[PDB]
């Protein structure tokens, strides 16, 4: 909520991705905290398993509800941190409701 | 421009890409958002930090706000706590 | 300090080009035999694989930690 991105670059979302889709490289932000300089999910590589949703300790990477993101060009499908963070901001209200409904189950 | 200031440059051979199509960058950069967060004052020497919401927050960590000299910062939220 | 990964011999092909990719900055490699590391139980068997497959080999002898004498009583010696 405060506005600090949840990911702390533990990079096990990269470790458990079955398709090798997520690429993460990190460095200590000036704050001294740990953040990802580059987080790239290749959606064409991704097979939407949902393990990344599972693996994240801070639950920073989530499987968002939207399924309609068909794109004219292949490059648009490759997603960097800014698109995903922007995707996160747009759908945060529903993502929060969805995680709210299913967390007891997990 | 972006978080870590990615600046494909005036001479790069990649800045060609944005021609006729905008770049993805972020407003409300996080780098400054927690800095905008007030310091959580506490009474106890040590304090927890569920991240807020328990299961929905982060691994629970106990921070030692023992020295006013430094406001403990949970390595996960970047929240400074003022003893 | 675990030694369970220093048990079996491995033969690894020489490392090759890893240029940065222009569109996303991902590492890109043109060498197919890069990520391949075959594991062989004994030095003799690994040498055999190189000879019949025709790859050049340069075996490195196993170096195991030398026995070291330790005894809690010894350091309590004020003398030394």
């Amino acid at each position: 909520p405060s506005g600090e991105e949840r990911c702390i670059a533990c990079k096990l979302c990269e470790a458990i991705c079955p398709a090798q889709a997520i690429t993460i490289e990190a460095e200590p932000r000036a704050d001294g905290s740990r953040r990802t300089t580059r987080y790239d999910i290749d959606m064409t590589k991704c097979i939407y398993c949902g393990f990344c949703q599972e693996a994240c300790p801070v639950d920073a990477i989530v499987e968002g509800p939207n399924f309609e993101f068909s794109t004219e060009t292949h490059e648009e499908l490759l997603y960097n941190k800014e698109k995903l963070l922007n995707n996160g901001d747009k759908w945060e209200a529903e993502i929060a409701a969805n995680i709210q409904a299913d967390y007891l189950y997990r | 421009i972006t978080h870590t200031g990615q600046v494909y440059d005036e001479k790069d051979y990649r800045r060609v890409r944005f021609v006729d199509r905008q770049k993805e960058v972020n407003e409300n950069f996080a780098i400054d958002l927690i800095a905008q967060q007030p310091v959580n004052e506490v009474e106890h020497r040590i304090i927890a930090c569920d991240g807020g919401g328990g299961a929905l927050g982060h691994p629970k960590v106990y921070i030692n706000l023992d020295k006013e000299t430094k406001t403990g910062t949970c390595g996960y939220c970047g929240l400074q706590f003022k003893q | 300090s675990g030694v369970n990964n220093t048990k079996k011999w491995k033969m690894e092909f020489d490392t090759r080009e890893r240029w940065e990719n222009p569109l996303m900055g991902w590492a890109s490699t043109a060498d197919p035999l890069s990520n391949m590391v075959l594991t062989f139980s004994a030095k003799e068997d690994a040498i055999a694989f190189a000879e019949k497959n025709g790859w050049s080999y340069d075996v490195e002898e196993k170096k195991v930690p030398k026995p070291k004498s330790k005894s809690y009583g010894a350091n309590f010696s004020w003398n030394k």
Partner: peptide, 24 residues
């Protein structure tokens, strides 16, 4: 309830010596 362009966001990994602009 009552076109993106992908790019690398990391920095230059290997900085390059710049020649001295002072002639010698």
């Amino acid at each position: 309830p009552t076109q993106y362009v992908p790019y690398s966001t990391t920095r230059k990994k290997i900085h390059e010596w710049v020649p001295p602009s002072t002639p010698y």
